[PDB]
Amino acid sequence: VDVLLGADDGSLAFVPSEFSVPAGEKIVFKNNAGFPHNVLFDEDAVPSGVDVSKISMSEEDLLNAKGETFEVALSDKGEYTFYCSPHQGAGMVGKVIVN
Ligand SMILES: [Cu+]
């Protein structure tokens, strides 16, 4: 499933910013507008047993061009919060439910 980084109107949002996926389904974050963006998962808001380092970009890695992707597949069921490191303070955060 595809999640856009930035809305077409320049909003600092994941599109969609909440969704559910079955365990192990590929999630493709696709750079859209309003760069730079990246994608990390919050170590304080993922299921027990999840290592966010395996499913997160480096803070230093920034997506600066339209169409770049970051793909992950989440095996453990439960709720995950992801965020954009440059824009976390601007509310660029989302939630995926793995079921
Ligand atoms: Cu962002």
Annotated catalytic sites, by residue?
37, 84, 87, 92
**Ligand 1 midpoint to CA 30 (Å):** 11
Q: Which residues are annotated as a binding site for Cu cation?
A: 37, 84, 87, 92
Q: Which two tokens stand for residue 13?
A: 């949002």
Beta-sheet strand order (sheet of 93-98) = 18-21, 93-98, 78-83, 40-41
**Ligand 1 midpoint to CA 22 (Å):** 25
Q: Which residues pair with 95 in a beta bridge?
A: 18, 81
Q: Which 3-state string (H, E, C) describes 30-72? A: EECCCCCECCEECCCCCCCCCCHHHCCCCCCCCECCCCCEEEE
Strands 2-5 and 18-21: unpaired
The CA distances from residue 50 to 26, 73, 74, 77, in Å, are 16, 12, 9, 10
Q: Which residues are annotated as a binding site?
A: 37, 84, 87, 92
Resolution (A): 1.4
Domains in the chain, please, with CATH?
1-99 (2.60.40.420)
Q: How was this structure determined?
A: X-ray
Strands 2-5 and 14-15: antiparallel
**Ligand 1 midpoint to CA 36 (Å):** 6
The CA distances from residue 18 to 12, 60, 80, 81, in Å, are 14, 25, 10, 9
**Ligand 1 midpoint to CA 78 (Å):** 24
